[PDB]
Amino acid sequence: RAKKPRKARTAFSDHQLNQLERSFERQKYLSVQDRMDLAAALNLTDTQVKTWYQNRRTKWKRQTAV
DNA sequence: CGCTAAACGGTT
DNA sequence: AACCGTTTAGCG
């Protein structure tokens, strides 16, 4: 067990995942404002959205490479 | 296991 | 500060 507390793993709802994915198809990168807006719309934290987008870009790149 | 959320150390 | 590349880990 890590010495430093980690954050609990967020479980996204179906609506949140749908909306995150619709954002991603439109824009692969968000401005600060568009990110902080999407977080508010989905009742997520700014960092949860930032992280989701970052990890989603990793997945996107993996799949561009096949 | 596999998908992926969060963590690490480095990079822009 | 946001990102990258990659790792590490939660959990269905």
Residue numbers in the entry: 228 to 293
What did the original publication write about this model?
Transcription factors (TFs) recognize specific bases within their DNA-binding motifs, with each base contributing nearly independently to total binding energy. However, the energetic contributions of particular dinucleotides can deviate strongly from the additive approximation, indicating that some TFs can specifically recognize DNA dinucleotides. Here we solved high-resolution (<1 Å) structures of MYF5 and BARHL2 bound to DNAs containing sets of dinucleotides that have different affinities to the proteins. The dinucleotides were recognized either enthalpically, by an extensive water network that connects the adjacent bases to the TF, or entropically, by a hydrophobic patch that maintained interfacial water mobility.
One BARHL2–DNAAC crystal diffracted to 0.95 Å, which is thus far the highest resolution for any TF–DNA complex. The high resolution revealed alternative conformations for most of the phosphates, sugars and bases of the DNA backbone, hitherto only observed in two previous TF–DNA complexes. We first assessed whether differences in resolution would affect the detection of the water molecules using the two BARHL2–DNAAC structures solved at 0.95 Å and 1.3 Å. Although overall more water molecules are seen in the protein–DNA interface in the 0.95 Å structure, inspection of the water content at the site of the variant dinucleotide at both resolutions showed conserved positions of all of the ten water molecules, indicating that at this range, resolution does not substantially affect detection of water molecules contributing to recognition of the dinucleotide. Analysis of the highest-affinity complex, BARHL2–DNAAC, revealed that the high-affinity binding of BARHL to DNAAC is caused by a combination of indirect and direct recognition of DNA. Key amino acids involved in the recognition of the AC dinucleotide and its complementary bases are Asn282 and two threonines: Thr278 and Thr285. Thr278 is connected to DNA by two water chains. The first water chain contains three water molecules that together connect the side-chain oxygen of Thr278 with the side-chain oxygen of Asn282 and N7 of the A of the AC dinucleotide (A7). On the other side, Thr278 is connected to N4 of the C of AC (C8) by a second chain of four water molecules.
